[PDB]
Design a protein around this ligand. Sequence first.
Ligand SMILES: Cc1cc2nc3c(=O)[nH]c(=O)nc-3n(C[C@H](O)[C@H](O)[C@H](O)COP(=O)(O)O)c2cc1C
Length: 153
Amino acid sequence: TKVSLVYISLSGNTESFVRRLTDYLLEQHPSLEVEKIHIKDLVKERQPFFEMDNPFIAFLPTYLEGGNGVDNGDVEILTTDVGDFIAYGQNASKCLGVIGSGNRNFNNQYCLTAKQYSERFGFPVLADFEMRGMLGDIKKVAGIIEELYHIEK
Ligand SMILES: Cc1cc2nc3c(=O)[nH]c(=O)nc-3n(C[C@H](O)[C@H](O)[C@H](O)COP(=O)(O)O)c2cc1C
């Protein structure tokens, strides 16, 4: 069994979480295969999108136009390449769910993009965390991953 973590990180918060989550998973399951796919790196290095051969979890930080933007400023910015990757071929049917990263000071817009992705593609929001996330978030997401990939505890 292989764990696939598809993410984007613009200021490093989600990148940090994915790194620490992977370290935690390997500490608990030394032989586990964990694949990280950074969408930003695929785009910048001018690599094409592809179809996943393995079920995966999406990690999506929240960036919205805000201000006096159309539809209460709830238009996604900067992260749309993640949506494109999921919308590619049959990737949506391969997505186990989305995990949102955000800032509680954004009140009702806290992790809104994850819910938008969930509503569009039909997979659930598995969890949300604030900024880099805490140990409690690491452990929770690790548990969800163990359940979803049927990993022995
Ligand atoms: C321009 C801008 C807009 C943001 N809008 C939201 C938002 O609407 N809701 C939210 O929960 N967090 C919002 N955030 C906070 C980020 O989602 C949060 O800092 C996240 O951890 C960023 O992850 P990253 O470092 O991997 O890019 C915003 C941050 C910036 C810089």
